[PDB]
Design a binder for this molecule. Structure first.
Ligand SMILES: Nc1ncnc2c1ncn2[C@@H]1O[C@H](COP(=O)(O)OP(=O)(O)OP(=O)(O)O)[C@@H](O)[C@H]1O
Ligand SMILES: Nc1ncnc2c1ncn2[C@@H]1O[C@H](COP(=O)(O)OP(=O)(O)OP(=O)(O)O)[C@@H](O)[C@H]1O
Ligand SMILES: Nc1ncnc2c1ncn2[C@@H]1O[C@H](COP(=O)(O)OP(=O)(O)O)[C@@H](O)[C@H]1O
Ligand SMILES: [Mg+2]
Ligand SMILES: [Mg+2]
Ligand SMILES: [Mg+2]
Lengths: 506, 51, 472, 166, 473
């Protein structure tokens, strides 16, 4: 491969050209280097949060601008840095490349191609700290995001521009719902209608490189990597890089949002973002706050999350949906960061290990799992046309509200008991198996007209699968009609009821 | 036959890495270090004279 | 030539400016520096020494260098005040948010004033008819008073605020101002378009609500001063115009949170459980700036977010002393299905006495409160042991209290997206008579489900009859 | 308005001395007297700087500062006030002397040892830092060659590293 | 070249400050040298303080350190012997052979501090390592290329579990193994050394398949925090240069973070939560990311963690949870219940437990076992106060089946037979899954619950029930 040799030759010649065009005199001198921190004497006119280059080749961000010497964090190890080293100034605030060539690639916090598939075609370069859209330049959420999870679709709706939190405990299924949504978006990501395209952008802050390798292998197996971008900040990387990565990914998604497209961001394990910020603030001798965390972690999370929004028609009616993930220690949602994030998001998706060990694979605590948007951002077929899909929330609350303390009194209580337990066994789903609205509607519609006559509990799963078969075969007209029009008309309600009762008699 | 070619790409860069070791070991045994200071002198003249 | 200073340190939101000239701007003076987009403004809080002042920035400190020219405005933040501010969206430093041009006005008042004197302290005994059963039966609201919506995250504070807006703010009230303090921008847009579609604000016409917004996206400094801007506009309407205004603050806890946010970097030793040592004094200043004077009346309804649904947290606990009719919302009854979620016991008001609401209303309220007390006292017996080992009176009280507690639920006009049931507004005497009838025992045969999500007792009768209907 | 910022930390004494000199006069006489004082204290180091230890009482400090001012009262102007204030405050008197020298040289000299990619030592006796660096560098490269030893210059090594990294 | 020499200024506990001369500043994490009368005292550099002064960490005790002593710079990070010759030689945090078996004749010497192997990472999560222990094989299979949990408090039996693994895995495996042993009792190390000698894994005049690293609690904090990296360096040399399947073993990773917290306070950093070092996650990730499957080769690492005061929410265990795929908590309550191993089946958890990898039948069996065991925990409160007679018939059936199961999870160990009196036994995966499914189906409900204690397969339960009905009843 001689071509990379002359490529490197011209690289080195422009390297010389760029290097010998500075004649800087404010280039500071390193006073002392700490654990990833370096105070430097110099840079009189340095901007805040501005990137720097060390003479060794390590980057740095200007956090503290106290008089005399400047607090510089390190994007990488303090391995190669010593005292008395000349520190080059970029002249610009920390930036990340943005563009459509990102799709199918894996990059780091800064944005360098780390997957090893060549350089990155970037259509632009946006800031890591950009202002959230104002009160007017936005529109309310109306278009629903189809997760493929029946418990996450018919019960806790999400849409373009909302902020749904996957709150839960360790290894409960927090990443599972996100990856399932990413796989589910493939149905419309393969078409031509751009108003229905949902490109996926995912952050990996703190997760080990093996986990992200398995994850990317997953998306490429199901052929979802072509519309997904992975930014990785493993625990091996320095705290500044982990702290910066989610902001860069937010800018990446905001590129699509401002260009009129629709995108989805998964803020996976935003807690280690907080601990990296803790390390940053403590190593900068910044006075800590509650339980050693920096004070402005609420502002940190607010500025990051509120960038996701649904734009109005004037600017292009783009969207950006935030999907953050927070892990809690022993189910303690009263913990500081869990409280901040539950107060910052537009609803939450609670997952707990107890229901997980009860058999419920999604482990969605419908008691606490709530969405600030209901009818809005929901497909109409899973709405008032189905009737009870307006009010299953009350039904699942009451069925839990009479388990043993509300002991069965009369036949109505027994009927509600059977209905509720059959439904809870029905809502079960398996990972790596996203579903579609056109076959959500029949299953839960059967949950109102004939569900207690299901063929015993251990065999309601193949009951739902056989119902799906009996509706995809010999009944494709119903599935189609409900999938393009998106709602159930009067004759369509009659046909659906007829089919449900026909298979009930079967 | 594709990732073998891809591995062929990756391995080729790897011996180029040890080639630089052969290159850099050639860099340290020259009188150019004496000649290189003149390169800065002419370069730094061109630098500030631009200003 | 005004006083000119140089930027010396930029640590987070803290900006330190040295004024080489001996003359120094006092604290609470607004500062002006040239930023590429607009004009970043500062705020002197401490006089460090050696002609150096410590300032907090109302906007982000991104892009600042040490040595930037700083201009002294010579005064606090001036916010436009007047009838022309109605129907406009205003930032923390006065400039409009909505792209509708400059706010043409002739009065600019500082956002830092003094609370009215004791000789100016007024009094009130009027009852605000809200149409909500619970807050009209157990915690009546006083016109020209303080209303506190205590609750956690996801309990329904903002929904209650929107319902109170839709009910009271329309017609009833000379003017009203809504102040968004560290709150979701999506809900701010929701408020804005509901306001525009309802007609309370008319863009080619007269408006009735003034909107100032400081949300979570803004840095702490703006979140600590937007409430004061809203106070300034509300006080200007109350005093000069002699009008009865409706100050609608949301998430007042965010102001104290923003204060604790910059307390540590200011150089103050933290207080208990990580709050600013000066929270009580500053928040007392802010609250006592909210009062009904002899020049006009102000009716304040502000929601208080309790961190981790704890009522013993210093901020909500210290706010409790500033609120006349506290309406605390409880999570438990919220997941029990009663979405009004007003706690029948803990929510207490000062206006509840026989000398104002009438002897009969006081008796009904006391009896229903003690019945709920008795019910919750027996919860252990019912739950872990069993309900069958109770006396007949204990049981009868249990069913009566359950019927009452699910009768406290009411439809909300702004809850159709969630409930799907049309909202209901039940008048005072209607609620009193219905609950008196339920108390006496005239309506014991009706099943409990007919009391759920309903209006008056006539609606309960209709629901019971219709339940018998489809039950066949 | 002193030309440079010493940012305090025991350096504010030098700035105060310079401001006291600048308010009326004697920018040089006080400084040369202080240089003579430092020469005297380094003349007898075992009695010079060991006596600047903090285990030495206040009236001991008064005695030592009175002992400093001899040999035709070389301490001229407000430097005696500096000795007094150092008696009842922080003791050792070497660092702030260097800070004051740095300040007065910025007032009169403006010399910095730049060279960027070159590790030269080109002190520049001129307040205009525009082209005099060219003459200084030319003189320091034509003769001397004090160190001028980059060992290895950064651009080639860093470029090779980034190229082999891909 | 000239020897870089400086003067010691401050000696603060285990922290030493050294002042150097013109442009003589050493590098971070670079070995220094003090000629102590006892021997060599190296001063690993931690931070730079300026003014030609550096803050260093001592790997040995700082006894007899006078300010102004001569220091010498090694010129690089701590160097340790690496190679097959290290097998059978017990070394230390610095690399000197502490087995007094002569000097080490290593051919290569590698630096202690390396970097993670980028994205040259394979992911072969399909190799279920047959352990033999019934509980782990079912609910949390151990991967051959993964990192193994072993959590638990004081005296919960984590070291015994490690000895069982070294007995069942190391013997029948092709590939070198390394035991680092961070901060454990020297008695345990001596027993482990002896046992590998008699077993034949290491022969003083033979092959030897284990490289023995050892840092106990007698070492100062710096050595206890560096010895893990020293052992990891040996593991990395064997995975790369030799291209073998390495089997890294430690005794306690919590001691590493504990020593980091020890040195952090005197290093001059603001304390983190519950008095830990601010650089907890970063340093622990640096330590545990170098240990990885590493495309040219593969590694299995049986980690071991101590929970402080039986707190699973402690920052160090909570942080190390995320860097492990197969975990084992070893809850104490199971220990006072007498079920040894005391692993909690409701918190063991592993990634490999998926129907595609372990099999549909195994997944269903494990799920039903989890349900049966979780119903018991759900009903515990009712059972504890009221009693089992207040439950329903289905609840009674489930609770008695759960009791039988949780008693059947116990298994004798070939290492702890002295503490049980029953010879150790091993059960294959196919046997234990079949036995558990048979018990779940209800085939064995007339059997007394006591018959499931200290047994292997279901046939052992049948035999024990036969004896119990024969003479006991
Ligand atoms: N629907 C499902 N069906 C089967 N297994 C599931 C399902 N959802 C989750 N799991 C399993 O639960 C475990 C945890 O799920 P997941 O990978 O989403 O982790 P997580 O909750 O995000 O946790 P972590 O924070 O540790 O990454 C895995 O073993 C996964 O296989
Ligand atoms: N399988 C077993 N059978 C019998 N006894 C066992 C078993 N496993 C552990 N024990 C007992 O548990 C106790 C503690 O054993 P061990 O030394 O392994 O504890 P540990 O948790 O590793 O300790 P530490 O916290 O001190 O490192 C001993 O009394 C030992 O006999
Ligand atoms: N009266 C009500 N009817 C229906 N839903 C309600 C009602 N009150 C609260 N909710 C539910 O509670 C959720 C949170 O309400 P919100 O006021 O945003 O929370 P907070 O009280 O924390 O501000 C909403 O998404 C809504 O669905
Ligand atoms: Mg996960
Ligand atoms: Mg709210
Ligand atoms: Mg042990």
């Amino acid at each position: 491969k001689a071509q990379p040799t002359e490529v490197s030759s011209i690289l080195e010649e422009r390297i010389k050209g760029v290097s010998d065009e500075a004649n800087l005199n404010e280039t500071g001198r390193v006073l002392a280097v700490g654990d990833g921190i370096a105070r430097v004497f110099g840079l009189n006119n340095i901007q805040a949060e501005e990137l720097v280059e060390f003479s060794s080749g390590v980057k740095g961000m200007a956090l503290n601008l106290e008089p005399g010497q400047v607090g510089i964090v390190l994007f990488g190890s303090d391995r190669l840095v010593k005292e008395g080293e000349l520190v080059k100034r970029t002249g610009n605030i920390v930036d990340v490349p943005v563009g459509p060539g990102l799709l199918g690639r894996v990059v780091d916090a800064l944005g360098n191609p780390i997957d090893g598939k060549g350089p990155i075609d970037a259509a632009g370069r946006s800031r890591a700290q950009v202002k959230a859209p104002g009160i007017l330049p936005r529109r309310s959420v109306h278009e629903p995001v189809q997760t493929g999870l029946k418990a996450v679709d018919a019960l806790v709706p999400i849409g373009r521009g909302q902020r749904e939190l996957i709150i839960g405990d360790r290894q409960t299924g927090k990443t599972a719902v996100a990856l399932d949504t990413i796989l589910n978006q493939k149905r419309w990501n393969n078409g031509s209608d751009e108003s229905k395209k949902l490109y996926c952008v995912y952050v990996a802050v703190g997760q080990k490189r093996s986990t992200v390798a398995q994850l990317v292998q997953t998306l490429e197996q199901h052929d979802a990597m072509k519309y997904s971008i992975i930014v990785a900040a493993t625990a091996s990387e320095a705290a500044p890089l982990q702290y910066l990565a989610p902001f860069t990914a937010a800018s990446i998604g905001e590129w699509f949002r401002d260009n009129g497209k629709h995108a989805l961001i998964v803020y996976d394990d935003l807690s280690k973002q907080a601990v990296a910020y803790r390390q940053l603030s403590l190593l900068l001798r910044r006075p800590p706050g509650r339980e050693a965390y920096p004070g402005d972690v609420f502002y940190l999370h607010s500025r990051l999350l509120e960038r996701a929004a649904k734009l109005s028609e004037k600017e292009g009616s783009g969207s950006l949906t935030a999907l953050p993930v927070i892990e809690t220690q022993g189910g303690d949602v009263s913990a500081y960061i869990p409280t901040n994030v539950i107060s910052i998001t537009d609803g939450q998706i609670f997952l707990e290990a107890e229901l997980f060990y009860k058999g419920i694979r999604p482990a969605i605590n419908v008691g606490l799992s709530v969405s600030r948007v209901g009818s809005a951002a929901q497909v109409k077929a899973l709405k008032q046309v189905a009737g009870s899909l307006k009010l299953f929330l009350a039904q699942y609350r009451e069925v839990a509200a009479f388990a043993q303390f509300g002991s069965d009194l009369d036949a109505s209580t027994k009927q509600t008991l059977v209905r509720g337990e059959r439904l809870t066994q029905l809502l079960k789903q398996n990972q790596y198996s996203p579903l579609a609205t056109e076959e959500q509607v029949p299953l839960i519609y059967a949950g109102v007209n004939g569900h207690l006559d299901g063929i015993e509990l251990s065999r309601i799963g193949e009951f739902e699968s056989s119902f799906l078969s009996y509706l995809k075969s010999n009944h494709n007209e119903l599935l189609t009609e409900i999938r393009e029009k998106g709602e159930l008309s009067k004759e369509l309600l009659a046909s659906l009821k007829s089919a449900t009762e026909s298979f009930v008699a079967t | 036959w594709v990732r073998y070619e891809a591995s062929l790409r990756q391995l080729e860069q790897r011996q180029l890495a040890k080639s630089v070791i052969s290159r850099v070991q050639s860099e340290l045994g020259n009188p150019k270090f004496q000649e290189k200071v003149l390169q800065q002198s002419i370069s730094e003249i061109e630098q500030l004279l631009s200003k | 030539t005004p006083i000119t200073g140089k930027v010396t340190a930029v640590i987070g939101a803290i900006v330190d400016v040295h004024f080489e000239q001996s003359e120094l701007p006092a604290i609470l003076n607004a500062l002006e520096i040239k930023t590429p987009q607009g004009k970043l403004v500062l705020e002197v809080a401490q006089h460090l020494g050696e002609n150096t002042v410590r300032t907090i920035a109302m906007d982000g400190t991104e892009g600042l260098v040490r040595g930037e020219k700083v201009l002294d405005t010579g005064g606090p933040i001036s916010v436009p005040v007047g009838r022309e501010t109605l129907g406009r969206i205003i930032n923390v430093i006065g400039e409009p948010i909505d792209e509708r041009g400059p706010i043409k006005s002739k009065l600019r008042k500082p956002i830092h004033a003094d609370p009215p004197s004791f000789a100016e302290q007024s009094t009130s005994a009027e009852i605000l008819e809200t149409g909500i059963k619970v807050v009209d039966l157990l915690a009546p609201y006083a016109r020209g008073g303080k209303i506190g919506l205590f609750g956690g995250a996801g309990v329904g504070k903002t929904v209650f605020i929107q319902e109170l807006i839709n009910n009271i703010a329309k017609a009833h009230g000379g003017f009203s101002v809504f102040t968004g303090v560290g709150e979701r921008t999506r809900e701010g847009n929701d408020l804005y378009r509901e306001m525009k579609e309802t007609g309370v604000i008319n863009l080619e016409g007269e408006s009735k609500v003034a909107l100032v917004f400081g949300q979570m996206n803004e840095p702490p400094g703006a979140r600590a001063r937007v409430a004061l801007t809203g106070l300034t506009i509300a006080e200007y309407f109350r005093d000069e115009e002699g009008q009865d205004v409706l100050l609608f603050i949301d998430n007042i806890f965010r102001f104290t949170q923003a204060g604790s946010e910059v307390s540590a970097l200011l150089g103050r030793i933290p207080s208990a459980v990580g709050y600013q040592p000066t929270l009580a004094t500053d928040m007392g200043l802010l609250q006592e700036r909210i009062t009904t004077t002899k020049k006009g009346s102000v009716t304040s309804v502000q929601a208080v977010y309790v961190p981790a649904d704890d009522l013993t947290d210093p901020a909500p606990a210290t706010t409790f002393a500033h609120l006349d009719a506290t309406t605390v919302l409880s999570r438990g009854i919220s997941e029990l299905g009663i979405y009004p979620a007003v706690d029948p016991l803990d929510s207490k008001s000062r206006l509840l006495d026989a000398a104002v609401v009438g002897q009969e209303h006081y008796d009904v309220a006391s009896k229903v409160q003690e019945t709920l007390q008795t019910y919750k006292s027996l919860q252990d017996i019912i739950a872990i042991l069993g309900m069958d080992e109770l006396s007949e009176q204990d049981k009868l009280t249990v069913e009566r209290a359950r019927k009452i507690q699910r009768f406290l639920s009411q439809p909300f006009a702004v809850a159709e997206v969630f409930t799907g049931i049309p909202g209901k507004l039940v008048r005072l005497k209607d609620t009193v008579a219905s609950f008196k009838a339920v108390l006496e025992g005239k309506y014991d045969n009706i099943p409990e489900h007919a009391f759920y999500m309903v209006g008056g007792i006539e609606d309960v009768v209709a629901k019971a009859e219709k339940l018998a209907a489809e039950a066949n | 308005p002193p030309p440079v910022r010493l940012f305090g930390v025991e350096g504010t004494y030098a700035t105060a001395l310079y401001q006291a000199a600048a308010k009326n006069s004697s920018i040089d006489a006080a400084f040369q007297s202080l240089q003579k004082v430092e020469s005297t204290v380094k003349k007898n180091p075992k009695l010079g700087h060991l006596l600047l230890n903090p285990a030495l009482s206040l009236k001991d400090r008064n005695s030592v500062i009175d002992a400093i001012v001899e040999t035709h009262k070389n301490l001229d102007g407000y430097v005696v006030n500096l000795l007094k204030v150092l008696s009842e405050n922080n003791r050792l008197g070497c660092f702030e002397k260097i800070a004051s020298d740095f300040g007065v040289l910025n007032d009169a000299h403006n010399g910095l040892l730049k060279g960027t990619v070159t590790s030269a030592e080109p002190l520049d006796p001129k307040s205009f830092k525009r082209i005099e660096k060219a003459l200084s560098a030319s003189k320091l490269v034509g003769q001397g060659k004090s160190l001028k030893l980059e060992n290895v210059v950064k651009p080639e090594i860093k470029g090779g590293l980034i190229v082999e990294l891909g």
